[PDB]
Structures are given as C-alpha cells and as structure tokens.
Design an enzyme around this catalytic site. Structure first.
Site, PDB file in Angstrom:
ATOM      1  N   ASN A 175       4.585  -5.906   5.133  1.00  0.00           N
ATOM      2  CA  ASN A 175       3.443  -6.410   5.791  1.00  0.00           C
ATOM      3  C   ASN A 175       4.240  -8.311   5.467  1.00  0.00           C
ATOM      4  O   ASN A 175       3.316  -8.926   5.916  1.00  0.00           O
ATOM      5  CB  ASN A 175       2.707  -6.473   4.849  1.00  0.00           C
ATOM      6  CG  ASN A 175       1.839  -5.167   4.367  1.00  0.00           C
ATOM      7  OD1 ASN A 175       1.707  -4.853   5.583  1.00  0.00           O
ATOM      8  ND2 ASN A 175       1.323  -5.186   3.402  1.00  0.00           N
ATOM      9  N   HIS A 212       1.714   4.292   7.406  1.00  0.00           N
ATOM     10  CA  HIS A 212       1.292   4.835   6.113  1.00  0.00           C
ATOM     11  C   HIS A 212       1.693   6.330   5.524  1.00  0.00           C
ATOM     12  O   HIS A 212       1.646   7.008   7.147  1.00  0.00           O
ATOM     13  CB  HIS A 212       0.049   4.269   5.800  1.00  0.00           C
ATOM     14  CG  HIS A 212      -0.558   3.285   5.411  1.00  0.00           C
ATOM     15  ND1 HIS A 212      -1.172   2.477   6.666  1.00  0.00           N
ATOM     16  CD2 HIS A 212      -0.540   2.241   4.542  1.00  0.00           C
ATOM     17  CE1 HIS A 212      -1.789   1.106   6.548  1.00  0.00           C
ATOM     18  NE2 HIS A 212      -0.900   1.136   4.872  1.00  0.00           N
ATOM     19  N   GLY A 235      -1.990  -3.875   1.523  1.00  0.00           N
ATOM     20  CA  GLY A 235      -2.034  -5.292   2.413  1.00  0.00           C
ATOM     21  C   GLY A 235      -0.396  -6.909   1.663  1.00  0.00           C
ATOM     22  O   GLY A 235      -0.322  -7.833   2.208  1.00  0.00           O
ATOM     23  N   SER A 271       1.157  -1.262   0.012  1.00  0.00           N
ATOM     24  CA  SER A 271       0.009  -0.251   0.123  1.00  0.00           C
ATOM     25  C   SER A 271       0.582   1.046   0.020  1.00  0.00           C
ATOM     26  O   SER A 271       0.086   2.458  -0.593  1.00  0.00           O
ATOM     27  CB  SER A 271      -0.993   0.553   0.942  1.00  0.00           C
ATOM     28  OG  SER A 271      -0.755   0.621   2.241  1.00  0.00           O
ATOM     29  N   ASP A 305      -0.577   6.876  10.817  1.00  0.00           N
ATOM     30  CA  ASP A 305      -1.255   5.875  11.384  1.00  0.00           C
ATOM     31  C   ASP A 305       0.317   5.122  12.137  1.00  0.00           C
ATOM     32  O   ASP A 305       0.197   3.736  12.916  1.00  0.00           O
ATOM     33  CB  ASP A 305      -2.226   4.881  11.043  1.00  0.00           C
ATOM     34  CG  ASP A 305      -1.655   4.222   9.710  1.00  0.00           C
ATOM     35  OD1 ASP A 305      -1.082   4.590   9.804  1.00  0.00           O
ATOM     36  OD2 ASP A 305      -2.141   3.713   8.785  1.00  0.00           O
TER      37      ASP A 305
END
Lengths: 212, 212
Positions: B100, B191, B70, B43, B188
């Site tokens: 990830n 990101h 993801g 992402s 967050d």
C-alpha cells in the site's frame, strides 16, 4: 450534477489497472452468462461471495456478484452503463452502495441510489430492484451512523411507491444498548464477519425468494 | 524522513474512527494476552484470519493478528510504537506490509520495512522477525509488479545477514506464462481468495514451525 449520480469510472492512480480489470470480467460474465439475479455494489456485496456462503443461499438462484471494494454510487452507475447490463435479462437486480460516498451529503447519496434504480429500470425494465439499507459502522456512536440512517430514511421513502423497487433493512440490531458494534459482527467496524453476514444474507435470501 | 519510516497514525478523514478502534483493541489484546506469534501488516495479514483457516494452522501457535486494511509501512511502525508491543514477549513477529505504500519508491518502502525490523529488534529483542515478500498484483504486467519485485530484492539482501531476521517468498507462482493472474487466486488481482491463501499460509506455517 450531484457527484453521486454523475457516472464516472474509478481512475487508476496506483498503476495495476485492477478496477478496470474487475469491470471487464463482469462485462465478459454478462456476455457469456444468463443470471437471474445480479448483485452490484461495494465491498459488502463483493465479500458476500467469499465470506458468506453464497454457494448455499445464492448460487442456486443463478446469480452474478459484481461488487467492487471502494465503489461509490457514481462508480456503480458507470459500470451499469458501460456493459455490465448488456446481453442479459435478470429478473432481479440487488444494489448495495452508498457507505463509501465520502464527502457527499445523505441527500446526494440518496440521489445516487435513485439514479441507479432509474438506470436499471430503463436498461432492464423487467427486473425487480432491491436496495439494501446502509449498515451502521464504527465501534461507537459517530456521524456516519446518522448519515447512513438518513440515507436509509430518504431511500425507503423514495422507493415506497415503486411496485417493483424494494427497500430492505437487513440490519439485525448490530448496534447494542451501550452504543457499541462488536468486532465479532464486523471485524473492522464496517465489513462483516462470517457471523455478521448470516442474518444479513438470510433477510435478503427470503426477500429474494418471495419476489422470485 | 523517508515518509515510509516516519511513524504516523492513519488520520480519520471519514468520521467513524475505525482505524483507532482497531489499534486500541490490539493494544488491549496485548495487555491481556500472551501470544507467541504476532502477525502485523496490511489487509493480506488481516484477512488471513477470516479468509484463510487461521484456526487450523495458526491458532495452535498462540497467535495475534494485528493486520489493518490499508496500512502502509509507516502506519505499522506507529502501531508497534504506540502500544501493540507492550505487555507481551512474542517468540516470533511476522511482518507483511509495503504493497500500500503508494507514492513511495521501492527503496523508500524497503527503508520502511527495515525500520519495522529495527523497532521489533529494539522493543522485542528476543523475537525472530519474518518478513513476507510482496505478492504480485494486477491482472496483467504492470509497474507495481516490478515495484514489488524490487522491494523483495532490496529486502532479502537487507535481511541476508540477520541471524534472527527471516525473509520469506511465499509466492507459489501466481503469475502465469501468459502474464496473467487468475481471479481464482486473487479475486480483485490483489487480495487472495481462500484458494490463494493456502499455499501462502503453508509456506509460512512451515517456516514458523522450523524456527519455533
């Protein structure tokens, strides 16, 4: 226990403690600010603050965004109980959660959204509460479209007799006649583009303005 | 099998088939376009196209964005094998994956990124390959910071003798002296904000320009 309405924090199985960090910053926001609108929910709430222009429609209204990508109803419930509603006296609480409740029937997810509305009504009895309908998802007809449409039915009927609880369907007609959702509205068939957010955010900004 | 370098598609356990829809649109992009740069990864690749200004730095360069929120290394591998490199002849392939790969040692994730570089070298022998370092993550010191720093070490040493494989550390110094990452860079703690993307995307846009 509906698992949807049992308050529980997201457990950290990755190692970097980000969920909890997100939650603590929102608690500190609440300790230190005096919003009139608090937005809470999953990543459609969260990315509205980046990926919409929040600053033009929603910042004037005195507004905190407590969206957390990946949250289910029960995670939002835990965060309203564990300090995101302290120190504050919003006029309006907007709630947009339920499309991540994987493994929950539409009736359980509805039970989740009702527990959120109930908690907001006890902890912040002065606020109006807005619940957004769950948007359609996936490129073609699929079972989460019918899940989300059934949640919206069961939710709108639940809220129909609450004077200060408003259900809002913000869907502009994202699904076309051929069944498809365009990646111009939703780049991954779930999350909204800048283009997808505009109609959504002006349906909400209107409702917000009548209420306020 | 390193699980990281074993090609496998993301299985749909939700119902709306979005991952596969994403993959098929990229395959159709590849059938119908003639990019000079293809971007692929998770992402941080994907949201660069929304959330950076892609259109100003990267659209001039003739560039497809095949990021999928993801994705692990092994998912990116499967998508390069199963039709995202057909019909095309990029000059440059940019790869940004590995944050990830939860449950994979840094050595396995490195093995994953090496298999990606190898596949791109066989299927598209003319292309240069750029691998971005994994960014730090989480608000405070944590074990995924040291995982990601160890992947970057093992990757940069792997690529050091490839004439047409470039490792790029785009981190501007996101972690501060007090150990923290600010939510202004990373909303967050993973990101990137619009602000967080700028230094990242101009370090990459430079490298892209020297190469091209």
């Amino acid at each position: 226990e509906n698992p949807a309405s049992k308050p529980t924090p997201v457990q950290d199985v990755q190692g970097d403690g980000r969920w909890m960090s997100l939650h603590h910053r929102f608690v500190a926001d609440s300790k230190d600010k005096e919003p009139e609108v608090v937005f809470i929910g999953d990543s459609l709430v969260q990315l509205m603050h980046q990926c919409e222009i929040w600053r033009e429609l929603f910042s004037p209204l005195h507004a905190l965004n407590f969206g957390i990508g990946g949250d289910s109803t029960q995670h939002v419930l835990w965060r309203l109980e564990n300090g995101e509603l302290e120190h504050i006296r919003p006029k309006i609480v907007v709630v947009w959660v339920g499309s991540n409740n994987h493994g929950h029937t539409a009736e359980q997810v509805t039970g989740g959204i009702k527990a959120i509305v109930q908690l907001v009504n006890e902890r912040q009895p002065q606020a109006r509460v807005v619940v957004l309908g769950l948007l359609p998802r996936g490129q073609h007809p699929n079972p989460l479209r019918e899940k989300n449409r059934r949640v919206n039915e069961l939710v709108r009927a639940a809220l129909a007799g609450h004077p200060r609880a408003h259900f809002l369907d913000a869907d502009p007609g994202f699904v076309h006649s051929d069944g498809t959702i365009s990646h111009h509205d939703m780049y991954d068939y779930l999350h909204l583009s800048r283009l997808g957010y505009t109609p959504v955010c002006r349906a909400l900004h209107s409702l917000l303005l009548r209420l306020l």
